[PDB]
Amino acid sequence: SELDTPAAVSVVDGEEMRLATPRINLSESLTGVPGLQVQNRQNYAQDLQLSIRGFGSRSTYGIRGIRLYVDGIPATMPDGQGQTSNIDLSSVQNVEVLRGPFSALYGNASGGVMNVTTQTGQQPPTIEASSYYGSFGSWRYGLKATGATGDGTQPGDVDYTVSTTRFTTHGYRDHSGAQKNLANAKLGVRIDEASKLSLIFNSVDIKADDPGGLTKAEWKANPQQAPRAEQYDTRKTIKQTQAGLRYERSLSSRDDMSVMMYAGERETTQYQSIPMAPQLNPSHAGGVITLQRHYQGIDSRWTHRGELGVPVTFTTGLNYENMSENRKGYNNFRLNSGMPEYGQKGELRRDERNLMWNIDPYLQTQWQLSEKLSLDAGVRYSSVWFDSNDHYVTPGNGDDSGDASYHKWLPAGSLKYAMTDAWNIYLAAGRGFETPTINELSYRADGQSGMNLGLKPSTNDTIEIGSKTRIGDGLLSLALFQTDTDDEIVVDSSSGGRTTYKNAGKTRRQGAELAWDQRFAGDFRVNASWTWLDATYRSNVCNEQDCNGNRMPGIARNMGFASIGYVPEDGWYAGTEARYMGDIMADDENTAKAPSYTLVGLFTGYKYNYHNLTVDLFGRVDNLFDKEYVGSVIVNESNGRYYEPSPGRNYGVGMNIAWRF
Ligand SMILES: O=C(O)c1cc(C(=O)O)c2c(n1)C(=O)C(=O)c1cc(C(=O)O)[nH]c1-2
Ligand SMILES: [Ca+2]
């Protein structure tokens, strides 16, 4: 339970996630999680940037500093690079956001862990056709067949959740149209009374134009413009298909075992806005990336519920996650006469086989020291080996083959005292560890060929106190944390969508996370939350001035959410949500700043139940007051193209037609 979790945890229920929502972006529904900053870039190539307590704000694409599991399959790779685009919002049961590295039961992460579980098929079988049309020619439809052959408690009882969605959009920005085909199957079969097998299949094909960032003047003059995106035809194709086998068994009344194996393949092509000039350097990797990532893994854990002086539940396991990378880079241009025609795959400029695999023994323990006092104490020993074998050796571009090994002990602990049956205080300490991604190692600020292997991994020590109190039909959670990070990986510079990274010697985050979910008499929901986050450099990361003490860019000091929704089981329902985002620094120097903004969204729908049929029609207006703001920044953009403008007042209408057999 959230209240019983001795750490900052938020659980966003899938149905609330789908309540009058487009079901396109996680930002639609995770906005109410304190300490979780979800930057919508209006860009399905780089996609949503998720940060937990400031960790991940450096991510120029996908997510970093957050370990994301989608139905047990890591969306975060052994190099720490993650993607949220494969999450099927239409089929999510719930999203668990764990803030802080306070559990050894998840891989290393500086910020936290996000677990997305797909709905388990239940009775009655249901086929749900969902559709949604929103501003900018946004159109997401989908079919979800979710059912089961029994209660799931008998051998051979099968549950299934098959869900396919097609999303298309012209995009708010110029050159930001995107198409995402998503398929997501969660099958389960009870082998016998003791065991349960679960198949996960996930597939996502994306073709998204990349609008890029705008300078302040560009954003002010025309927020929709994407001039570099037009010139370079910056765009991204993704094709990721993963499968997962989760075998759970009960070996005894006190013992359980769980083996989660997975294997997926992600094919990426990304045309970037790097001009020809830098690519004329033989050491340059070009302006187009083609990536073929084959990831597999097996996490085998044993949970024993015994007593050593006091009751103690320990989950000890071994996690293996391997990823191979066939990574190629081409010129993003071909020369017509003497002029580069961009948006084209040119001459090969990079060709390497990278291999990043981590092996982590881990042991989590939960001692009931007293009736009210409990102690989590876990340690994960993460050993990560990276090996780049460079196949691109030309004059001025030598053998860039290298390797690295990071071996980190990650202890976490938590003392939780039950003030009352409804009020728990907790004090959690934890060590987080973040290796640089392969892409973060790929590029040197000095422009020479070879990986930036001087990029050290970051290690963060997080202390946190917290208090969760049930205030009726709801939870009030307060968390106060300090995270001191050594060698924090930060964006050094970004140009044309390509980012070099460096290590900030010392950073400090001090934050408070208040959350309040409450259901009132009469189908009323109130979800409030406030995040305060002082994320500062404790060392100078700037090459030209003292930025020591400056706010870390990409991180809002304050975020706020307040949604009130009248959502009865059927009939007319409605809701409104105010989302405050504090201003965000776009550079280490704290000279470029995305202004703070308040976004008021409204929605109203009608659910009609006619025996086996449910028709949920709804209309929503996001950014009700038409606030001009920037939904995401590109930190340390070398040309000051920090700003990813957000739409303005926009609308959507959705229909969810469910038939229960
Ligand atoms: O979705 C992906 O798998 C993926 C991979 C990569 C990569 O590893 O090169 C990039 C991106 N996306 C991306 O969106 C992006 O803007 C980007 C820039 C670069 C680079 O090498 O400069 N890689 C990538
Ligand atoms: Ca080389």
Author numbering: 39 to 699
Copy the relevant paper text:
We determine the cryo–electron microscopy (cryo-EM) structure of the PqqU-PQQ complex at 1.99 Å, showing that extracellular loops 7 and 8 of PqqU undergo conformational changes to fully enclose PQQ in an internal binding pocket. We observed unambiguous map density corresponding to a single PQQ molecule within the extracellular region of PqqU that was previously identified as a potential substrate binding pocket. No density is observed for a metal ion in complex with PQQ, indicating that PqqU does not cotransport the compound with a metal cofactor despite commonly forming a catalytic complex with Ca2+ or La3+ in PQQ-dependent enzymes. However, PqqU extracellular loop 6 coordinates a metal ion, which we modeled as a Ca2+ ion based on the analysis of the structure and density maps using the Check My Metal Server. A total of 12 amino acids from PqqU interacts with PQQ and originates from extracellular loops 7 and 8, the N-terminal plug domain, and the β barrel. Three arginine residues R304, R365, and R536 interact with the carboxylic groups of PQQ, contributing to the binding of PQQ by charge attraction. A plug domain–located glutamine Q84 interacts with the two carbonyl groups of the central aromatic ring of PQQ, which may be important during the release of PQQ, while the plug domain tyrosine Y99 forms a π-π stacking interaction with the aromatic ring of PQQ. In contrast, in the substrate-bound structure, PQQ is entirely enclosed within the substrate binding pocket and is not accessible to the external environment. This change in accessibility of the PqqU substrate binding pocket is largely mediated by major conformational changes in extracellular loops 7 and 8, which move inward to form a barrier between the PQQ binding pocket and the external environment. Notably, Y99 and Q121 undergo a near-180° flip to interact with PQQ where Y99 forms the π-π interaction with the face to PQQ. These conformational changes are triggered by the binding of PQQ to the open state of PqqU, with our substrate-bound structure representing an intermediate state in the transport pathway, before substrate import facilitated by energy provided by interaction with TonB.
